[PDB]
Scaffold this active site. Structure first.
Site, mmCIF file in Angstrom:
data_model
loop_
_atom_site.group_PDB
_atom_site.id
_atom_site.type_symbol
_atom_site.label_atom_id
_atom_site.label_comp_id
_atom_site.label_asym_id
_atom_site.label_seq_id
_atom_site.Cartn_x
_atom_site.Cartn_y
_atom_site.Cartn_z
ATOM 1 N N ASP A 120 -8.900 -11.456 8.092
ATOM 2 C CA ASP A 120 -8.383 -10.090 8.157
ATOM 3 C C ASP A 120 -9.308 -8.924 8.502
ATOM 4 O OD1 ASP A 120 -7.343 -7.585 6.049
ATOM 5 O OD2 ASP A 120 -5.945 -8.370 7.544
ATOM 6 N N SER B 263 0.365 -5.911 10.430
ATOM 7 C CA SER B 263 0.779 -6.779 9.345
ATOM 8 C C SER B 263 1.952 -7.677 9.730
ATOM 9 C CB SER B 263 1.141 -5.946 8.113
ATOM 10 O OG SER B 263 1.423 -6.799 7.020
ATOM 11 N N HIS C 259 -9.658 -5.125 12.497
ATOM 12 C CA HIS C 259 -8.554 -5.626 11.686
ATOM 13 C C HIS C 259 -8.143 -6.866 12.467
ATOM 14 C CE1 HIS C 259 -4.195 -5.053 10.003
ATOM 15 N NE2 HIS C 259 -4.946 -5.736 9.160
ATOM 16 N N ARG D 119 0.828 -1.206 0.000
ATOM 17 C CA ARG D 119 0.000 0.000 0.000
ATOM 18 C C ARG D 119 0.859 1.251 0.000
ATOM 19 N NH1 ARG D 119 -1.502 0.748 4.279
ATOM 20 N NH2 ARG D 119 -0.873 -1.125 5.442
ATOM 21 N N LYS E 87 -8.300 -2.824 1.148
ATOM 22 C CA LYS E 87 -8.255 -1.991 2.339
ATOM 23 C C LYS E 87 -9.053 -0.706 2.179
ATOM 24 C CE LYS E 87 -5.518 -4.641 4.893
ATOM 25 N NZ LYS E 87 -5.899 -5.214 6.229
ATOM 26 N N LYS F 260 -2.101 -12.973 11.982
ATOM 27 C CA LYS F 260 -3.550 -13.122 11.872
ATOM 28 C C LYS F 260 -3.983 -14.234 10.920
ATOM 29 C CE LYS F 260 -4.436 -8.875 10.725
ATOM 30 N NZ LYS F 260 -3.026 -8.414 10.761
ATOM 31 N N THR F 261 -3.452 -14.224 9.702
ATOM 32 C CA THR F 261 -3.814 -15.237 8.714
ATOM 33 C C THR F 261 -3.163 -16.587 8.999
ATOM 34 O OG1 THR F 261 -4.183 -13.588 6.998
ATOM 35 C CG2 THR F 261 -3.775 -15.847 6.263
ATOM 36 N N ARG G 73 2.504 -12.047 -2.030
ATOM 37 C CA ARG G 73 1.200 -12.478 -1.539
ATOM 38 C C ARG G 73 0.479 -13.412 -2.491
ATOM 39 N NH1 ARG G 73 -1.257 -10.029 3.526
ATOM 40 N NH2 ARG G 73 0.314 -8.458 4.094
#
Ligand SMILES: Nc1ncnc2c1ncn2[C@@H]1O[C@H](COP(=O)(O)OP(=O)(O)OP(=O)(O)O)[C@@H](O)[C@H]1O
Ligand SMILES: [Mg+2]
Ligand SMILES: [Mn+2]
Length: 535
Positions: free
Chosen positions: A264, A245, A227, A60, A208, A249-250, A328
């Site tokens: 996410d 990030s 988030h 981003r 996002k 989380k994932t 990714r």
């Protein structure tokens, strides 16, 4: 079905070819077109999945993010120039927005366009109907994967609440005169309900961007917008995992012992926790099939690899981060076998876990937070990394991103904290802090050991155990945990001497204290004694 004679009121003209709701098969042929060259061209990997190159931007671009300041957003948005804390919500004039819209709409005019109608939000009562427009097949593919794919019926009477127009190929030569950051731009207008993207091809900006809009709308309606990843056990018990990030989380929500809700973005309303997406966006740098089997198995036809190095024979070098560390892969959520369906949602979360990768090696692997500590650490949104684990040498650098996702916050941090606290209290939820980062060894705790800590948290092993308090941060940590090395529980033991931990804990404590100072402008914020570290 829809007709081309209904998609020009957005300012897009002379579109001869319209590809509405492209199928995965058509996207495949578009991406592998033998005559296609440049960044739109994808390559087929031996895993069956197509891989693409997102160009200059591999992540981003917060510095290029702008929100139009008009009477719709004036007194509600958390503005970057209102000293209410540092953030990326830079004010944009309606006039400049028109210029940007002009650039994007002209860039898409006279082109073959892909139009993807989808939902952001698993619940009909709060979801956003979004229409995505792009001239790049893989960008359409990205949104098809990440957002909720509507039913034939829903598509028939689809009415867009928001329009996302991707004009990656265009740039803004007037940025200097307009006081913008660069020739690129990611702009939002809440009056026209539209997002514009110029310069950057990174699909993540679309994902996002809508997350940012959900974060604006939901809290004002008393619904937490988070988030976090989320999953549920056989018993129906739900857990959410917050974190910046790369904190896990994932990786950690994709757990063989639980059903995946989402990885996410989630909301928490009167009924429970619900996913905003229809897909997962996993990190692939140094991906290990053995360590993350499910995610790896999800990489097949229809998944979309981003920036990974593909060799001549189609094999993927997941370890190559020479282009970017942010390689990714996006894939429809059903590419993971054990997920919740037909709708990605469940009951109220009773376990709230804050993930952090502490490059300082001070925070304990796991601790149970008090009510006030939960709020303190939520507002702190901490994580750390080395000044260059691929650039220079050791130099733990902190990142304090309010609510574990300041870059996506449209309202003030306290507004997210308030709604989260309310939902937590009503459900009797308990919060935990987990350091998926480092300790005295300088090496990151293994995923295997981390999954073990999560196991202990979810099955109650942690709660039903004796604990002692870690100084400075005053964190309650268990004396022992099944399937976990008792030695690592106290971070001070991973050091030659508790003195070494002490010196670093002092430095980190000061950083936390200084970072939190900006929140003490209110009676409640004055809760400095809460989790608040103390030297
Ligand atoms: N103990 C650990 N726990 C979790 N992840 C770990 C651990 N050790 C290494 N990792 C790696 O750290 C990364 C964590 O990434 P993950 O995709 O889960 O981040 P995220 O929180 O989901 O980030 P984002 O919000 O950017 O998508 C993965 O590449 C994973 O392989
Ligand atoms: Mg993730
Ligand atoms: Mn994220």
């Amino acid at each position: 079905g829809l007709t081309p004679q209904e998609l020009e009121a957005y300012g897009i003209s002379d579109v001869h070819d319209i590809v509405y709701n492209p199928s995965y098969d058509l996207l495949y042929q578009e991406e592998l077109d033998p005559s296609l060259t440049g960044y739109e061209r994808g390559v087929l990997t031996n895993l069956g999945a197509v891989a693409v190159d997102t160009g200059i931007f591999t992540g981003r671009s917060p510095k290029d993010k702008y929100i139009v300041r008009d009477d719709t957003t004036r007194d509600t948005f958390w503005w970057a120039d209102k000293g209410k804390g540092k953030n990326d919500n830079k004010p944009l004039s309606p006039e400049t927005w028109q210029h940007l819209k002009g650039l994007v709409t002209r860039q898409l005019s006279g082109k073959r366009l892909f139009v993807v109608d989808a939902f952001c939000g698993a619940n009909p009562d709060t979801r956003l109907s979004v229409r995505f427009i792009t001239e790049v097949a893989w960008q359409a593919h990205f949104v098809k994967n990440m957002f909720i794919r509507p039913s034939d019926e829903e598509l028939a009477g689809f009415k867009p609440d928001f329009i996302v127009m991707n004009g990656a190929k265009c740039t803004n030569p007037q940025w200097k005169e307009q006081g913008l950051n660069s020739e690129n731009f990611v702009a939002f207008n809440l009056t026209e309900r539209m997002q514009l993207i110029g310069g950057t091809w990174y699909g993540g900006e679309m994902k996002k961007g809508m997350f940012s809009m959900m974060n604006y709308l939901l809290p004002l309606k008393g619904i937490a917008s988070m988030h976090c990843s989320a999953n549920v056990g056989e018993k129906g018990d739900v857990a959410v995992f917050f974190g910046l990030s790369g904190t896990g989380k994932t990786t950690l929500s994709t757990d063989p012992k639980r059903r995946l809700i989402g990885d996410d973005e989630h909301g928490w309303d009167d009924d429970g926790v619900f996913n905003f997406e229809g897909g997962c966006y996993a990190k692939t740098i140094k991906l290990s099939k053995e360590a993350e089997p499910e995610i790896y198995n999800a990489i097949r036809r229809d998944a979309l690899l981003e920036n990974v190095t593909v060799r001549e024979d189609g094999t993927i070098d997941f370890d190559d981060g020479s282009k970017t560390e942010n390689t990714r892969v996006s894939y429809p959520i059903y590419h993971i076998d054990n997920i919740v369906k037909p709708v990605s949602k469940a009951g109220h979360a009773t376990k709230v876990i804050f993930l952090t990768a502490d490059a300082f090696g001070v925070l304990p692997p796991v601790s149970r937070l008090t009510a006030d500590q939960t709020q303190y650490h939520f507002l702190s949104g901490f994580t750390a990394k080395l000044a260059g684990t691929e650039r220079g040498i050791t130099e733990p650098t902190p990142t304090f991103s309010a609510c574990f996702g300041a870059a996506f916050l449209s309202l003030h941090p306290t507004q997210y904290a308030e709604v989260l606290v309310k939902r937590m209290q009503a459900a009797g939820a308990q919060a935990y802090l987990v350091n998926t980062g480092w300790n005295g060894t300088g090496k990151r705790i293994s995923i295997k050991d981390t999954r073990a800590i999560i196991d202990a948290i979810l099955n109650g092993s942690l709660d039903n155990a004796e604990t002692f308090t870690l100084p400075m941060f005053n964190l309650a940590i268990p004396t022992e945990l099944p399937g976990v090395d008792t030695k690592i529980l106290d971070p001070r033991n991973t050091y030659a001497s508790p003195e070494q931990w002490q010196e670093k804990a002092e430095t980190l404590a000061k950083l936390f204290i200084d970072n939190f100072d900006k929140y003490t402008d209110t009676p409640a914020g004055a809760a400095l004694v809460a989790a608040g570290p103390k030297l």
